[PDB]
Design a protein around this ligand. Structure first.
Ligand SMILES: Nc1nc2c(ncn2[C@@H]2O[C@H](COP(=O)(O)OP(=O)(O)O)[C@@H](O)[C@H]2O)c(=O)[nH]1
Ligand SMILES: [Ca+2]
Length: 160
């Protein structure tokens, strides 16, 4: 496919929140023994425009990809409050290490584990709003809201 832009995304968050899984769900749209996908690409369509997305689970060239990041998916696990409590630390890196146009989107992953919910939708939304973040709850496992996660960022990126 004949893209016209390249948006670089980072994905960041505590270990085990589902970053690789989110990346794989988005880039393959579908192996516990594996380390887990680190990097991926996908040509999406956003406002009648074809854009190549580069997506990197980042946890020299790394610093240069950071500085050129159009978007940043900041991920927590809704079943583990500690991953939510670490969000201000990730946001500091996400802001400090990228550039002034970088669109940050908060993702509350593992939403399918509803019986294990440890963080409310509401408190997380208030954090997002306070910090000017887009915010979705998602499930990398089922695929619920995973495209929207990547596509919502991309639409806001395109407006600049
Ligand atoms: N139930 C559920 N498990 C998930 C989800 N996303 C990831 N996992 C599991 O969480 C574990 C760690 O996921 P991974 O993507 O490697 O996390 P990472 O360390 O953030 O890259 C694995 O056993 C995944 O199968 C999800 O949306 N729902
Ligand atoms: Ca990973």
């Amino acid at each position: 496919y004949n893209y016209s832009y390249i948006f670089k995304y980072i994905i960041i968050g505590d270990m085990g929140v589902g970053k690789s899984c989110l990346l794989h769900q988005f880039t393959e749209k579908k192996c516990p023994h594996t380390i887990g996908v680190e990097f991926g690409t996908r040509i999406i369509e956003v406002s009648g425009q074809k854009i190549k997305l580069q997506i990197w689970d980042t946890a020299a060239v790394t610093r240069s990809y950071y500085r050129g990041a159009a978007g940043a998916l900041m991920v927590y696990d809704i079943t583990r409050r500690s991953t939510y409590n670490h969000l201000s630390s990730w946001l500091t890196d996400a802001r400090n290490l990228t550039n002034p146009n970088t669109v940050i989107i908060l993702i509350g992953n593992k939403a399918d584990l509803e019986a294990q919910r440890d963080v409310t939708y509401e408190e997380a939304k208030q954090f997002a709003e306070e910090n000017g973040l887009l915010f979705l709850e998602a499930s990398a496992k089922t695929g619920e809201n995973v495209e929207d996660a990547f596509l919502e960022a991309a639409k806001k990126i395109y407006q600049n």
